[PDB]
């Protein structure tokens, strides 16, 4: 059946501005781009920045919790944390407990996240102190 | 330096309805769930359905092109295509890919082919003003 996430398409108003974001600060190997989109890659992940003229740069106050996270090495956390803080990448939550994570947003207001830890490490941590009404399955 | 997509969190109004969707129709291995969220898996992918009370089930006409795709075997295409076509999963685009949506209006996609196969296809017939690297 389904293998995994094939690609991720993000609607962006300004293409040049948004693609510069992902190309420079996160440094996703920009494969190709054209007049109405761009393809970027990040190892197993495939990112597509499709130009949509109906995408207003929505503030986090006017957006739902839907966000997109990225896997970064634990050692390389502070480095990329400053990378966004020094570049003025805006924040939308502080991430209290739950591990080590830094929440932020892109130019067009797509809520993003930098996280250290896989699902297995999260599930193990929850077995210690679980959430409200948490149930396991395996 | 940072590796691939760590996880994907989706805001959902009704949890019970949403949790059933990904668990039953797709082959998402539901790991855990609680009063305001759930953890599901899809091989290398980690999916989180967070319960948001500010998430209206938005129609596709009132949503941007931002969507999330899934890799499915070419042979197993019709199988999961039938599963959604028979279950009445509403579609929003079609032009090998199958575009549909979740209960809360999150635009989704079923695609066969990786980026390398796509980049090769563009090297044959490229888009308007396409530039490669
Ligand atoms: O009539 C025409 N329509 N048209 C559209 C495009 C186009 N622009 N961006 C994308 C595109 C590419 N890749 C992706 C991905 Br991957 C994704 O998720 N969205 N997406 C859009 C496409 N497309 O072929 O789908 C080019 N030529 C034409 C002609 Br000629
Ligand atoms: O006072 C309290 N507030 N509170 C919130 C939660 C909670 N609800 N959803 C998530 C959640 C989990 N995992 C994830 C992921 Br993975 C993700 O992307 N979002 N996300 C949210 C959490 N959380 O553990 O952060 C639990 N306990 C409490 C207490 Br006690
Ligand atoms: Zn797509
Ligand atoms: Zn998160």
From TrEMBL, chain B:
Entry's Pfam families?
Glyoxalase
Positions in coiled-coil regions: none
- VOC domain location is 4-113
EC code: 2.5.1.18
Q: Which GO terms describe its molecular function?
A: glutathione transferase activity; metal ion binding
**The entry's keywords:** Metal-binding, Plasmid, Transferase, Zinc
Q: Where does Zn(2+) bind?
A: 7, 67, 109
Matching entries from SUPFAM superfamilies are given as: Glyoxalase/Bleomycin resistance protein/Dihydroxybiphenyl dioxygenase (SSF54593)
Residues involved in Mn(2+) binding: 7, 67, 109
Q: Where would you find the membrane-spanning parts of this chain?
A: none
At the top level, the lineage of the source is Bacteria
- Is Zinc-finger there in the keyword field? no
Spell out the NCBIfam families in the cross-references: 299782351_fosA, Fos_GSH, FosA
Q: What is this protein called?
A: Glutathione transferase
| Species whose genome carries this gene | Escherichia coli
What gene is this protein a product of? fosA3
């Amino acid at each position: 059946m389904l293998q995994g996430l094939n690609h991720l398409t993000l609607a962006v108003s300004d293409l040049a501005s948004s693609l510069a974001f992902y190309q420079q600060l996160p440094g996703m190997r920009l494969h190709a781009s054209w007049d109405s989109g761009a393809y970027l890659s990040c190892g197993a992940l495939w990112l597509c920045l499709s130009l949509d003229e109906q995408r207003r740069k929505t503030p986090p106050q006017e957006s739902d919790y839907t966000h997109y996270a990225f896997s970064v090495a634990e050692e390389e956390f502070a480095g990329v944390v400053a990378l966004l803080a020094q570049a003025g990448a805006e924040v939308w939550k502080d991430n209290r407990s739950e591990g080590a994570s830094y929440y932020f947003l892109d130019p067009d207001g797509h809520k993003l996240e930098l996280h250290v830890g896989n699902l297995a490490q999260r599930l193990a941590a929850c077995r210690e102190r679980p959430y409200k009404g948490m149930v396991f399955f395996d």
